[PDB]
Design a protein around this nucleic acid. Structure first.
Length: 627
DNA sequence: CTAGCGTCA
DNA sequence: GATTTGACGCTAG
């Protein structure tokens, strides 16, 4: 009441006094609040509306007394984001003050506790706009218990607020979190927000001491929390896609679809709906009686009917082409706004530490383009080539070479591995027993896959699968005997997992795998394979994340350099650099991402060096190596 | 072999 | 009639 403070109704002395307070504060507890009003605090992470405000509970202790006269203790500041209909002078005043307060919030020296902070920072930048840029949020550190939770038990499906409090609090602190407008009145929503905010504070301190207890603290503070405003930045920009050519690929794919639909009717002898599995089941078995109740339309069955009638193949083809148009063309086109796409990045996304992305999945778009048969000439679909730098600018893309293999060397310690101008060709040529130059990309494509599969515990079965089955047991031993230390490393990770129940990456990231003790043998074996994988891939995720923070701060503070970091494929950062600035940018990126070997500074000493690999180009599809 | 997201029957 | 699963499709090592 005086415990919910609307800065817009503050008089002029106390505006200055309020920012003074935000500086002096021992803690700030923030959350966004939507037009509902709900908060992210939270309702399934879908409050169903655009944003209106930010609520900041200021804990003036967490010396002597403090009484401001304009507030209660501890006050809750209410910062109005929402634009009114028409835009005039005092509103300009108000918004300037809001911008001012929010800026202070980002930069201040005490702990700042926020839940889905990335969301917060992204919203503040939308609001901030041109009035302050994306580097005035890079230093921002704020404590997001969704992340602390995810660090502690990574498996756990990324939780709501409730779940977390009732789990991690002592004792019986609580929330009234349902509150909306129209579900409730004004007072209900706002007093519930202050209460939920004191709650979120305690949830958070408790989670912190948990981290310190599990040795996940240094990991939290140095890798994850600084990564937060970086992800927030990438969401605030968007990559441009080639609209005309995109819509043309949809036109291409569209035809062959209508054409395949036509051939299907003809052979079937009736004009039916080809997308309907029912009618096609009625046709294949109702009418053509191909079985001699009905089996299904699944792809195994239709494959079995390949001979009998010419219906199946046409169907399967319609289906494959339909999958292509939908995922590659129609899906991406659903995502665009203004001819641009920007994925949401999920830091709690996986168990190994890697990030993940939705809408679209930018870590999922295929490397190599694909073929659909163009009917009434030679052309293709490449989905990546539909992502383009705006003009004049060029994508620079920096990438860690064979990073998991390098880590595997650092961990195992293998001499024959360490001894080992592009590495993969060399086993690709030994398989080939050839001179480097004539080995095709597909051979490296199968060779690298061969190595990954064999290092992670793959039986001779799938190894042969990806070729004679007995022949390869032969390959495998050849491989495992070549490098003994890789077997010793796996044996080590596995043994430590049975020993402690979890296993830990280079930087402290943990993967509990309790089924290591599980009596069932396929389960036990899975947990083992998983552990051995995790130490490696978890470590690589740690490294990539570090590289991303360092590189991002390097580009952040430069007077000359304009480069915006745009996206991250797992091992590869991708920047959009202003055109003349590629050589400068490539230089910085190189320098920075290599220098990692010692920035812990030196906790982390890589017995094998990190080589970045730089590429550049106007479109994401065509990027020439540069060197 | 290990991690993800996206499209379906 | 609508709605959620487990295969397989791609991705990254």
């Amino acid at each position: 009441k005086k415990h919910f403070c609307d800065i817009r109704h503050l008089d002029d002395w106390a505006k200055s006094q309020l920012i003074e307070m935000l500086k002096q504060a021992a803690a700030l507890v923030i959350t966004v609040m939507y037009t509902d009003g709900s908060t992210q605090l939270g309702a399934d992470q879908t409050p169903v509306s655009s944003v209106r405000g930010i609520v900041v509970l200021v804990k003036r202790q967490a010396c002597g007394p403090v009484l401001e006269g304009f507030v209660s203790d501890d006050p809750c500041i209410y910062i109005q984001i929402e634009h009114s209909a028409i835009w005039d002078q005092e509103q300009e005043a108000h918004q300037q003050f809001a911008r001012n307060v929010l800026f202070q919030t980002m930069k201040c020296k005490c702990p700042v506790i926020c839940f889905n902070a990335k969301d917060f920072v992204r919203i503040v930048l939308q609001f901030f706009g041109n009035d302050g840029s994306w580097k005035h949020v890079a230093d921002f550190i704020g404590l997001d218990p969704r992340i602390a939770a995810w660090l502690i038990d990574p498996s756990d499906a990324t939780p709501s607020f409730e779940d977390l409090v009732e789990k991690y609090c002592e004792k019986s602190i609580t929330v009234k979190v349902n509150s909306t407008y129209g579900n409730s009145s004004r007072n209900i929503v706002n007093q519930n927000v202050r209460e939920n905010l004191k709650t979120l504070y305690r949830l958070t301190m408790d989670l912190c001491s948990k981290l310190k207890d599990y040795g996940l603290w240094q990991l939290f503070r140095t890798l994850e929390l600084p990564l937060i405003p970086i992800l927030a930045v990438m969401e605030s920009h968007a990559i441009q896609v080639n609209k005309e050519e995109m819509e043309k690929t949809s036109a291409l794919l569209g035809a062959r679809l209508k054409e395949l639909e036509q051939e299907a009717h003809f052979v079937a002898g009736e004009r039916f709906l080809i997308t309907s599995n029912n009618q096609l089941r009625e046709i294949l078995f109702g009418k053509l009686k191909l079985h001699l109740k009905y089996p299904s339309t699944s792809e195994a069955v239709l494959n079995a009917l390949r001979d009998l009638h010419p219906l199946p193949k046409i169907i399967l083809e319609y289906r494959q082409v339909h999958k292509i148009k939908s995922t590659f063309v129609d899906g991406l086109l659903a995502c665009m706004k203004k001819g641009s796409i920007s994925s949401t990045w999920n830091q709690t996304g996986t168990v190994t530490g890697r990030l993940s992305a939705k809408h679209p999945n930018i870590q999922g778009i295929s490397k190599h383009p694909i073929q659909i048969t163009t009917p009434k000439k030679i052309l293709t679909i490449s989905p990546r080539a539909m992502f383009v730098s705006s003009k004049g600018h060029t994508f620079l893309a920096a990438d860690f070479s064979q990073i998991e293999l390098r880590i595997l060397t650092h961990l195992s310690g293998d001499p024959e591995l360490l001894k080992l101008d592009d590495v993969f060709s060399t086993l690709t040529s030994q398989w080939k027993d050839v001179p480097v130059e004539q080995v095709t990309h597909a051979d490296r494509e199968q060779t690298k896959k061969v190595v990954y599969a064999v290092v992670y515990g793959a039986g001779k079965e799938r190894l042969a699968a990806c070729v004679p089955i007995q022949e390869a047991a032969q390959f495998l031993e050849s491989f495992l005997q070549k490098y003994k230390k890789i077997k010793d490393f796996a044996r080590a990770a596995i043994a430590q997992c049975h020993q402690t129940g979890c296993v830990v990456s280079i930087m402290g990231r943990r993967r509990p795998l309790p089924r290591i003790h599980a009596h069932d043998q396929q389960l036990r074996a899975q947990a083992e394979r998983q552990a051995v994988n995790f130490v490696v891939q978890g470590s690589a995720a740690d490294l990539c994340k570090l590289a991303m923070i360092h590189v991002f701060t390097a580009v952040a503070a430069s007077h000359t350099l304009t480069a915006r970091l745009v996206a991250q494929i797992h091992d590869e950062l991708l920047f959009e650099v202003e055109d003349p600035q590629i050589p400068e940018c490539a230089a910085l990126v190189r320098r920075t991402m290599e220098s990692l070997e010692q920035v812990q500074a030196l906790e982390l000493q890589l017995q094998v060096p990190l080589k970045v690999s730089l590429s550049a180009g106007r479109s994401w599809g065509h990027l020439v190596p540069l060197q």
